[PDB]
Amino acid sequence: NSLFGSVETWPWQVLSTGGKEDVSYEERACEGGKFATVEVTDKPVDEALREAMPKIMKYVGGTNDKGVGMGMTVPVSFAVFPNEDGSLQKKLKVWFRIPNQFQGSPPAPSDESVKIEEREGITVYSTQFGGYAKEADYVAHATQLRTTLEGTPATYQGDVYYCAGYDPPMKPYGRRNEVWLVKA
Template sequence: MVDLVSFWTSSQSSLFFKSSYLQPGVPLIYWITTPIFFQQHLQGKERKKWEMKCLLNFLEAFLFKDEVAFEERTYEGGKFATVELTGKPFDEAINEAVLKLLKYVGGSNDQGAGMGMMAPVCTTVFPEDDGSLKHKVKVLLRIPSQFQANPPTPTDESIQIEEREEITVCSTQFGGYAKEADYVTYAAKLTSALGDKDTYHKDFYFCNGYDPPMKPYGRRNEVWFLKK
């Protein structure tokens, strides 16, 4: 039995962290009453810092909700476990692929090795002309460093081990439990922010999730455009 918690170790490799204290689906009253409760225990400068932080979170969530911040980032190459699925909607396909990869890193391999879970889970998607996603995904998970030289062979034949080169991406980040619609929305925002620059691939992009499903708040998701 795979312990999903112990196999998921979040990698905070990002140079840019966009605050996501306000999460979709959580009543606004929670975000009002919680700061009030906690600030009663703060005094002086600490209380003022807390109040300013709450104000900035409010402004970010409600006044600047249509803005998008982004950065350019480079990731080293290496060996990845990959699963390719076609004919299924994004949300269904990614759930199936991630489960396969979790089983692989949890010990379903020729060495019976529990490798640990790297982050993010990176999914290659292929947009239609209207921005919606084709029913085709390729989900990638980096092999942990101690297994890079000799990755265990998956017992599931649908999982392939690939050597991938270093990449440079333009990345934007958002919170919440990300679905297809969220990735499509932020991909459109990133496209708008970048303008007509022909320096990034437009026939595919990457959807990334960093957190296990049992983490309800402070979640991190990213859209990456690959630089040519």
């Protein structure tokens, strides 16, 4: 009668894929699912990330309204805003991507700083790469992602990019990463 499977997590619209070695792109339209996001201001991206991490982990750690102690972790992504001067604008918005099972029913935000917001309507270019990533690698991948998207009508708004990883990598913990550019 009803047909479902175990492999289903984020239905999105991928238009195509096809980049370069290491930096490979995919332009896709977002699920539109509800995610847990925290935005930090006043504090630089360095501080904002480390300050937002507690806020993300406290949510899945048990400080959620449903009292879920299931610490579920998939790659976490945060938006950064680079100015044309090369300097990042001090505003950082962390998006915590919720696993599919919890998309159907996510716990309510019991912390005022973390909000469950749904994001749809926009198209992103995502580059998936593997290896030991440092903070510079995210920037470099964004740089190369722009370089690879060169010659296309792809424009970006605020040149915003998102950096995805399971943890903030210093060296070994951060082997799978994503960088998302949003088309203007």
